[PDB]
Amino acid sequence: VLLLDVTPLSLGIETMGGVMTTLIAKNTTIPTKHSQVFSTAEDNQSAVTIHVLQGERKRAADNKSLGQFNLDGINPAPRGMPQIEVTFDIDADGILHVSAKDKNSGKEQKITIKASSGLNEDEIQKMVRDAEANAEADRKFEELVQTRNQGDHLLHSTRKQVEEAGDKLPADDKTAIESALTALETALKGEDKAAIEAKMQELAQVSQKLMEI
């Protein structure tokens, strides 16, 4: 065939730390369906937001919002435990159906997005250009976010372990650790990946006993 219908830009959702995670690659032929399992960013999280995006940028905020919806009633559990199945389906008429289902609870929610939605031809071509021109920075952002997310999770973990050991932790230990937590929390607000990792390392360095515990 010399011609075909495609979705002209990547389609996905916003994941932890404000990054776009693609479900349907740009220029995929339609109709099409793609499903992927996601989980929860933090412990005891009972709801997620599915923010549907179109575009090629790594920063979710830089892409075109097509819609959103929440999925609630998730049983509070450890981060990473819930299995939230996210399905993007584009029919032959270019109508996009997005659903999210929590496998445990069977709770589900969905949205329908009209074919005429999103970016027009000139906006599409600018999007592609802007993505190319910003490829290095978008990659750095992506890497930054992966590190922030790791550091974020290190905070929570460490904090839960310090409470979990209570008495059995030397005060000088606890102190070193509390201070390293603060430094890390501060670094996380920054945009310097190495700085965050360095604070992770300093924290690891003073957590050895707590790690024994």
Binding site: I13, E14, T15, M16, T21, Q36, V37, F38, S39, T40, A41, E42, Q45, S46, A47, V48, T49, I50, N70, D72, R79, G80, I84, N149
Partner: peptide, 9 residues
């Protein structure tokens, strides 16, 4: 591989 989702609001 396993990506995570923010809470609402």
């Amino acid at each position: 591989k396993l990506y995570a989702l923010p809470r609402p609001t």
